[PDB]
Design a binder for these strands. Sequence first.
DNA 1: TGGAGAATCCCGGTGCCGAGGCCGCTCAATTGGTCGTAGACAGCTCTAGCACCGCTTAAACGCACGTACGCGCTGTCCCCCGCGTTTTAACCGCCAAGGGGATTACTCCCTAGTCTCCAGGCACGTGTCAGATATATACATCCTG
DNA 2: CAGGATGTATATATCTGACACGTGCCTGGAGACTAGGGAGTAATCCCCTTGGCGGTTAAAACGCGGGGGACAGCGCGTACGTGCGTTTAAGCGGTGCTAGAGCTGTCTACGACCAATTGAGCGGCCTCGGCACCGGGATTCTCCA
Lengths: 98, 98, 107, 108, 112, 221, 81, 80, 362, 94, 95, 104
Amino acid sequence: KPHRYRPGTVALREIRRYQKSTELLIRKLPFQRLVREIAQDFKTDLRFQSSAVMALQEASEAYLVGLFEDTNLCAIHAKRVTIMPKDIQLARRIRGER
Amino acid sequence: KPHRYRPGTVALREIRRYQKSTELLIRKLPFQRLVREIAQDFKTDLRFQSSAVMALQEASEAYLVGLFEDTNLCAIHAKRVTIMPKDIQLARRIRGER
Amino acid sequence: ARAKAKTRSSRAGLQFPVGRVHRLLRKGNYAERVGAGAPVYLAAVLEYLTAEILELAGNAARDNKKTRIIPRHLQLAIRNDEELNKLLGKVTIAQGGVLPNIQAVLL
Amino acid sequence: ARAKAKTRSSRAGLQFPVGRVHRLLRKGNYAERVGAGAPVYLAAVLEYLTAEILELAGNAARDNKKTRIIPRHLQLAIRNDEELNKLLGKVTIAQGGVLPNIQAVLLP
Amino acid sequence: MDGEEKTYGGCEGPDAMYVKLISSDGHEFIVKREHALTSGTIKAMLSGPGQFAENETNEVNFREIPSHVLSKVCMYFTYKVRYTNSSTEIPEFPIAPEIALELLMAANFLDC
Amino acid sequence: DEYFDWVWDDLNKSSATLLSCDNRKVSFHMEYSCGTAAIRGTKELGEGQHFWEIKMTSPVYGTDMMVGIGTSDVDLDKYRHTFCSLLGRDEDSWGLSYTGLLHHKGDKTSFSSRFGQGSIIGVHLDTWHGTLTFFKNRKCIGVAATKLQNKRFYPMVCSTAARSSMKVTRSCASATSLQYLCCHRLRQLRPDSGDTLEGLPLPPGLKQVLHNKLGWVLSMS
Amino acid sequence: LRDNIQGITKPAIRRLARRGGVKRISGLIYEETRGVLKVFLENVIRDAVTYTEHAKRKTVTAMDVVYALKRQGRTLYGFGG
Amino acid sequence: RDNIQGITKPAIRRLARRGGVKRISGLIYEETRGVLKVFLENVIRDAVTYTEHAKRKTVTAMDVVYALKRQGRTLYGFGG
Amino acid sequence: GASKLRAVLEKLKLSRDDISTAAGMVKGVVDHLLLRLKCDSAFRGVGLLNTGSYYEHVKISAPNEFDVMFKLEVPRIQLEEYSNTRAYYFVKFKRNPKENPLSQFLEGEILSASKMLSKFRKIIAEEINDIKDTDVIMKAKRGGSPAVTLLISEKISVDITLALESKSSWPASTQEGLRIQNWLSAKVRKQLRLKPFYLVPKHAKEGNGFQEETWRLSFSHIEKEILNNHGKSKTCCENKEEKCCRKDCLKLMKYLLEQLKERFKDKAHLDKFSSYHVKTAFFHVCTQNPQDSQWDRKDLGLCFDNCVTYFLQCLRTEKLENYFIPEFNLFSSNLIDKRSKEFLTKQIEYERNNEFPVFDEF
Amino acid sequence: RSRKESYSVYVYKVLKQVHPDTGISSKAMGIMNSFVNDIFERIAGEASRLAHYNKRSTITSREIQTAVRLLLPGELAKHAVSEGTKAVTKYTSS
Amino acid sequence: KRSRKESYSVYVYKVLKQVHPDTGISSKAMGIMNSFVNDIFERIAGEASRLAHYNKRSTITSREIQTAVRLLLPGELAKHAVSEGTKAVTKYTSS
Amino acid sequence: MDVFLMIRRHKTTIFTDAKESSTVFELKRIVEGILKRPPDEQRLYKDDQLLDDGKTLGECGFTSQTARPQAPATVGLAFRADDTFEALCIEPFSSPPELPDVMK
DNA sequence: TGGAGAATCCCGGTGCCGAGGCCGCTCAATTGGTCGTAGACAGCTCTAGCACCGCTTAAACGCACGTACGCGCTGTCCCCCGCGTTTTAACCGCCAAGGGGATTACTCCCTAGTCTCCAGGCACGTGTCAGATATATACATCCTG
DNA sequence: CAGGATGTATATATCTGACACGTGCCTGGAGACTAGGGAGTAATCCCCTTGGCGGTTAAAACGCGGGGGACAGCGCGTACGTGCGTTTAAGCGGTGCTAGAGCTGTCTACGACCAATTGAGCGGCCTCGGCACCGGGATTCTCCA
Ligand SMILES: [Zn+2]
């Protein structure tokens, strides 16, 4: 009962651990299924290879982790701390990619 | 008394003409002096072709007029309508070229 | 022996010069040999893309009711189409200007 | 007849293979009469530039008490430094991770 | 027409085949009898008695007519007695305006 | 005025026309205009010289109304049931329409200005020189035709408008004579004047008999 | 195989936001993140296949993937050269 | 010598109006003067570095577009 | 003479205000029908073509018989000739980002007009019953383009038409047409060519029946602008003195071609001849005699006589070519029987020789 | 004397075959000329890279067909490959 | 049959092993420098094809490439990269 | 075919129309038939040059071309001075007036 | 000002697998020679960068003053965050099948290189008509009452 | 709500210089031919994608209590927008001028090509030591009184 920390402390203690860490965070096989599923609308009967799927997570999660990091810079400018979908739609427009 | 337009109704008549015209907004001679004076400490006694000057001006107008547009979207997201130096410093690091 | 010179453009039916594109593709240092079909295929895709642009610009120019196309009408045609605008996304057309919009909360 | 050979990298003073590069370049369509200034420039320049990316690992490995240099340390030894991170920031270094950073308004 | 003996050289009394026509200024214009009879004055005059004898001098002097005028009268007679009843195109009869101004008097003077 | 030299022909008028005013006047298509109608004048022209003129009265309209000359080989009732140009159709026959255009030999030439309601037209013929001349409003338009020698003709006029009429105002004949030929040549040499009697001691009785014989020549060009 | 996009879970999208340094989160964003990843993937996989077709192969291999990222300016060092 | 104060208050205003902004702070002017000078400092350094291979004493239009094209700023109208 | 024509012109003219009183009834119907149609995905942009006067009044003696035309604006399209007929086309879409108009009317690749009209018929037919303040009824089909026709009570009546609008350059098949240059100067020719153009649905027809799925060009908006602004001087008829008989000469000519059909409708041989042909012949004529000096009110006679002269000449020779598509022969043996043509020359030339008897019936 | 060469006539000929009635100012021709130069060089750059990737010594229809459906977005790629294939069969069949 | 394949390893190693004597390196720490050096190759060889047609120079030679490497390395590192390719233009010229 | 001509001497100014093939001697037979002086007692001169009776007027250049209907060409008759040609006995016509300016 | 979980900073011993070293050999880099045209130069010429001089009126500077925006504070009630429970689906280690990516032999038809000929682009230079300009009038909108 | 004052739209009429043409001619695009070697094919083989199995326990889905963040509404006085009068520096038309980039004849120094030799670096087998990993004792910092 008594130890329960004040809200928003555990949300700072856990960013430190993931910024020291270096491994990859999307669960592996659930992404491997999606890349064969999404490919089928361009061509058919098509084989992959281990290093062709492994290199493709490294491409994906490295752009998601670089996106959130300046949505977080947009919410603070609006005098907030909670991230919400109106913010990411600003970030991926100042980033030119529309 | 005589005919005063209310604050804001002449500012909208303004953006609604600069968004439907083509030409340069900075004066010629004052931009030429700055270009020669910046240059004279990479090497001495350069000469310039006239169209090398016009190619620098056009590349700078389109850097500034496109940076103010991202500055506007930043200031509006924060519920203001007035631009401030804290919005310039947001745009230049989400744009990310630093 | 030297018979009459029939130019290749008329055979494949283009307006683009099937001869000059062959010489440029030879001289430009791209590869060791230039195949026979490359100058025909390439002139046909550059025909398609230029023809697609020119009539959208013409439609803007003609509703603005002028005899000639000018850089403002190119801008208003390309910068206003979902897949021409994607194809040339990072190029500043000299003396084109910007297309008008006001952010809705300023009104 | 047939005197002892001297390697043409040593004849230019380089460490980089002025031999191997001249094959790549002259068969590579990029220029036609490959005057020795060209196999030598494309070889020469990159000497320091190929070491900087592990030289600057002294900022990482010995400092962190490790004696085998590793991809994470190679990542930090590029993505750490002032101009290094503009000089080559437009590229992702695989298995790197990210630098420690928190914004000042969010903490107690 | 050759060897024109005509039994007597002509018919020069009752049917006198030529008649002798002097102008006031003395030019003599012989005319063949149908050309003579073309003038109403001359056919009336040749119808006169005594002139039908072979002993007649078939002569006139036109005191009222000068020689240049009388030539055009003869030209007109020779023209019309030729071209009358022509089924082919009859040629024009142009006469010089610079001398012709008077010639209408011949119509009333000679009945022509 | 002096009495004209031929009437319209009672025996040679089409099956749809009434001759009138002592056959000086004539009328056509008094109801239906269900075809073309025509007449000749009573006199065959083929000897000597002729001159005549016609006054219009009903307003011009319809396919063609025209004036001219032709052989006896024409048929006044071929087009009894049909609109056609009867004059000008053949080597036999010529005519001028109110639109200012001639026909001959089954072909056309533009020749003059137009003419309409109340107009007056006059025509000269010389059979000796085988030639024909046209006048409007006491002024000359030109020589129409030549090479016409020894062919025999009647004068013909044709109609197609309903309720339409015309009248010959004068018609005349002459021989060739000095008072014809010399007077013609004289008028070719002074056509610029409105008159020809000017400057002449020539008797007023002779001036009047050439007012009779060649009334046009002395006073038109 | 179908509908593996729902295999991008809430807590995976939370792990990726910890490395971005973000503190509180709106419950609407998990449906927005899975909307931007969908079109990241498409423009990469739709070029690795076009290289493979030009090769006339049936298999797809790491070099085709790095040629794809490289083409669109996301270039990566560590799987080839 | 200065010359950076040659970009006046009303010039910096017209750039913001074409960019679509309605109302302006007063400290903006000495902020933009520090941003423009650091842009020109980098493109002029590359264009003069091309001009030495090209042997000339004159900087050409094509030296400056090689430097823009190298920075990431392609530009239709001046040829090339 | 000219007094008969001046009189019949008044007797035509003074009927006009009855049309103006009737025009209120159709207005409410067309307004409801637009507000019906704008709800449907297939028609969201549809609109009245003749803005500011919501009808065309196509028969001058029929003051209850309106015509209405709806423009349906279409993005950008490609066209090709049916069977080298020059005036008739198949149409197909091209390069367009994802904003489908109604591709559901596509069949293989052609946009099906027959599918379009099938929906258009149905949606009007199910709507029009809900007009409750007025008796209104749909009248059965006659032909390709007016396939919806409508009656209010037992008088006020409408044919409804729809057309595609396009903004693009006009086809190469018209390049030599519109010979306005000497009449109205090249500066107006170019600025008139600077307008949109229209396609109307029309089957080809054959001994085998018909190529049902085809379109034909249309230029009626331009045709109105010429006639409205008909002077070599801009101010022609814009003041009382600068008046000219051009307009009068045309409307007199339209009226005649109905009167002759009234007297021979039982023979059926004249039924193929329309006020469309009458306009077309008039444009060649005013092109031929283009100075405003020829069109004094003190004429009227010769200009009207020139129309019948020209029309007879065309009709004898089986030749009348479209004024915009300068080689498409409307009088051709393919489209009209020789017998009807020669028969009509016999009628018209009889009327001319009889001094226009049929206008005495008024 | 020294001599210069351009795409000017051919783009003018294409214009005069879709708006066969409309002109272009000298400044507006300059942009169209730099546009076709850019697109040629993008396509040729992936063609030369494809030939290197796949170890070959020539550029042919098979190379340019992949570069077009690689550098052109969405339905422009779908249309451009038909304008390509239909123009070469007209040539090999002549 | 065996199909032999090369890398830059030994040439970078001789510029590095001057500074840190007391270290070794894992396999996945080699590919980053291979792909860096190989990236610059075809990018500068493309610049070399351009340089050739820029100043009409079919004999490419050192001084034409030169500009690209005072350009591509920002800061005083412009001098580092160009110094390596300029210390080359001496001895080979004299056999 | 007969050619319109005019024969001139002293008073005489005589129109005639002889076959073009006629000898110059046949002109003398015609002249005797009109003027009774026999064919040899007569002589002929053209302009003011002697002409032989043994010729034909066609070979003497007197022809259908010289025989215009209103200008049948002139020929010089002679009646012998017992031994020779006499004078070219021609005498002038009455001089015609000017056409006055009122007619111009 | 005292508590107590989470590490975490640092340590012990253990373990294994991968990186650092050695050998065989073959194939690609070099020596020595021959050869042909690129480009390094000395002159010429003529055009484009730099510099100067008045004039005009356009717009940058300086000021007063009113008002509506930016800035602070308070209350409250939604909407996450921190914890325990039940479970379901990764990662895992191992395995049997067979598909096509990678390698060779050999044949030939496609291309580059050559010589000749000649017609389609290029540089030049006159004309005229498409748009910029001025002035007058029609119209649509904002503001105070 | 009506009525005034102001700024924008438009439609002739004027004038001049930018675009579309005609042509002299020359140099680069078609015609013919042939001598090699790049690419096409048929046959081969073996390693590496593929699909399957039970399994351990790490990780995800669910729920539930309530604290403080998101946000509405209220007060407010300072900073900026509108506009009038003065005055100063950009832009214009015309002159000069010579510094420099472009063209070219010519000749000699450099890089492509070749055959024969042998040194540099690549592929395969080996083994101990660098840095992980399992228990673990010590040492901080937040949250309540
Ligand atoms: Zn009028």
